[PDB]
């Protein structure tokens, strides 16, 4: 059955000590219940080895926010998929809109990063999404379809190992908001192109997370949509009560 | 007095466990002597917090291999200078030839990264160097002078806090080698442009490390040059006996 998932993307926030304390605080806050979803914290590279021993692995997984497009070697400053896996992390965000925008990540580079993540037993959280000019031109479907080429070269077995996350990049800094109806529409389209590629069973087993603004006050309405399987959380990931309030949206 | 320094750049090598074991092995190998130089290990981001407690801080410092061009925030995958400092690391490599070549690092980006490193108490190891086509055209001096603009916007007080490293990028994969005489020539030129900017005292206090191929068999000849103050070590950084053999070149 398709997994519901709440994954926090800490982005470039938290010193070593703050990230350790945040992970401890989140673990304490979830101690008295079994969340009705998978929960993941995606941290900067510096925290991974320090936070994996601090969280109940039956409730909280750990992810990196990126990995390199090579397995190892003369790539000063880069951190490989094998390195990420060696910390105990089981997930990696790939293709985040900030890396596409600022760091030149292309379809080909992301295709290689996904392969390396899978070769090291990591679950990619593969991000897609269109910018304001694309949304205003009604090009969102063709944009996300083109971005999915990084993962549609995978075999069916390999594709079944990945999570997708949709980012309405057009809603950043513009005052705009993707309504729950708009989120459902594009999530349904994404699932349909997965089905076109691999058939309905693979598509129906893919978790497609909403990566726009997600807060305790809007999470239940977003997640109640049939094609929205949880969230890749930004700002609310950095405050325990807000992150837990989103996790609570899946309570039975 | 100007510092002699042997700094190892691990590049994108070593799982978490391998880097911990390598740091322990190096610490054990240096236990019975006080090296006659500063010694630094520059590791991937994943190791920093795990390796700083394992090395004798009076003998071995720890560095990162890069840091972000922003202080904090919505830069998924990037690790900030503040994050690096919070691990106990005191150094950061900036401007390595691999990042200039592969990751689009410009004069302006590197100027900002150096400022952020200094704002967080880190000592930059700022790398410069020309490629084969530039060396064959005898343009090495103008190339390194242009690259130094990222740091010549610093005040004299701030510039005094940085280390330089010269990379003969033209010697990678071409069968070529920068002779000790060639290393001395370009190191002397680099020191002369530091003197042109800040005066002779600041220039005479700047450590300028050789970043080409450095092994136990060539380290004494390289380091005996008056303008070569040690090395930024590549392959030999990953084997204790080789790294120690380079450190031994400074023995009295």
Sequential DSSP letters for B70-86: SSSBS-TT---HHHHHH
Find out whether B198 and B156 touch, Cβ atoms under 8 Å. yes
CA A162 vs. chain centroid, Å, equals: 10
Find out whether B169 and B131 touch, Cβ atoms under 8 Å. yes
Residue the block writes with tokens 């000790």: B180
- B29: helix, strand or coil: helix
- CA distance readout (Å), A29 to A47, A56, A161, A185, B163: 19, 11, 29, 34, 45
- The neighbour count for residue B217, using CB atoms within 10 Å, is 11
Name the token pair of B58.
């009076």
Of residues B105, B111, B130, B167, which has the active-site annotation?
A: B167
How far, in Å, CA of A130 to CA of A108, rounded? Answer: 18
Cβ of residue B77 closer than 8 Å to a chain A Cβ: yes
Find out whether A80 and A71 touch, Cβ atoms under 8 Å. yes
From A65, A70, A77, select the one nearest A40 (Cα to Cα): A65
Find out whether A220 and A193 touch, Cβ atoms under 8 Å. no
The 8-class DSSP code of residue B139 comes to -
Query: Beta-strand (E) ranges in chain B?
Result: 5-9, 38-42, 60-64, 91-94, 123-128, 163-166, 208-210, 230-233
From A2, A4, A1, A55, select the one nearest A249 (Cα to Cα): A4
First to last CA, chain B: 16
- The neighbour count for residue A142, using CB atoms within 10 Å, is 12
Chain A positions touching B11 (Cβ under 8 A) are 73-76
Q: Residues of B numbered 34-63 whose beta carbons fall under 8 angstroms of chain A's beta carbons: which are they? A: 44-50
Find out whether A48 and A89 touch, Cβ atoms under 8 Å. yes
Interface contact flag, A13 B87, Cβ < 8 Å: no
- CA distance readout (Å), B63 to A76, A119, B39, B149, B156: 12, 29, 10, 23, 23
- CA distance readout (Å), B212 to A206, B39, B95, B187, B234: 48, 17, 15, 12, 8
To one decimal, the resolution in angstroms is 1.4
- The neighbour count for residue A32, using CB atoms within 10 Å, is 6
Count H helices and E strands in chain B, helices first: 12, 8
- CA distance readout (Å), A212 to A166, B103, B242: 7, 28, 50
How far, in Å, CA of A191 to CA of A166, rounded? Answer: 11
Find out whether A157 and A172 touch, Cβ atoms under 8 Å. no
Find out whether B15 and A82 touch, Cβ atoms under 8 Å. yes
Interface contact flag, B48 A50, Cβ < 8 Å: no
Instruction: Confirm or deny that A32 is annotated as ligand binding.
Output: no
From B81, B21, B69, select the one nearest B239 (Cα to Cα): B21
Which residue pairs from A148-152 have beta carbons closer than 8 angstroms and sit at least 24 positions apart in sequence? A148/A190, A148/A193, A148/A194, A149/A107, A149/A111, A150/A95, A150/A107, A150/A108, A150/A110, A150/A111, A150/A114, A150/A126, A151/A111, A151/A114, A151/A124, A151/A126, A152/A197
Experimental method: X-ray
How far, in Å, CA of B147 to CA of B188, rounded? Answer: 16
Which of A50, A66, A80 is nearest residue B77 as measured by Cβ atoms? A66
Cα-based angle A143, A115, A238 (whole degrees, multiple of 5): 70
Interface contact flag, A76 B99, Cβ < 8 Å: yes
What is the phi/psi pair of residue A6, to 5°? -120, 110
Plot region of B205 (φ>0 → left; ψ -120 to 50 → alpha; else → beta): alpha
How far, in Å, CA of A89 to CA of A51, rounded? Answer: 9
- CA distance readout (Å), A88 to A29, B27, B94: 22, 25, 28
Interface contact flag, B66 A74, Cβ < 8 Å: no
Find out whether B234 and B213 touch, Cβ atoms under 8 Å. yes
């Amino acid at each position: 059955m398709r997994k519901n998932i709440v994954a926090g993307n800490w982005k470039m926030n938290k010193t070593l000590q703050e990230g350790i304390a945040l992970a401890k605080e989140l673990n304490e806050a979830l101690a008295n219940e079994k969340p009705n979803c998978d929960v993941i914290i995606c941290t900067p590279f510096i925290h991974l080895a320090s936070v994996t021993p601090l969280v109940d692995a039956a409730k909280i997984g750990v992810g990196a926010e990126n990995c390199a497009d090579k397995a190892s070697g003369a790539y000063t400053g880069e951190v490989s998929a094998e390195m990420v896996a060696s910390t105990g992390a089981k997930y990696v965000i790939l293709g985040h809109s900030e890396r596409r925008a600022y760091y030149g990540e292309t379809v080909a580079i992301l295709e290689e990063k996904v392969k390396l993540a899978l070769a090291n037993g990591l679950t990619p959280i593969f991000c897609i999404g269109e910018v304001l000019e694309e949304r205003e031109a009604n090009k969102q479907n063709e944009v996300v379809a083109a971005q999915m080429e990084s993962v549609f070269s995978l075999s069916a077995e390999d594709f079944s190992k990945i999570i997708l996350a949709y980012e309405p990049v057009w809603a950043i800094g513009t005052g705009k908001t993707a309504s729950p109806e708009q989120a459902q529409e594009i999530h349904a389209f994404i699932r349909s192109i997965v089905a076109d590629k691999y058939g309905k069973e693979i598509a129906d087993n893919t978790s497609i997370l909403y990566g726009g603004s997600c807060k305790p006050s809007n999470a239940k309405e977003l997640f109640s949509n049939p094609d929205v399987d949880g969230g890749l959380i930004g700002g609310a990931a950095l405050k325990v009560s807000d992150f837990k309030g989103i996790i609570d949206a899946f309570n039975a």
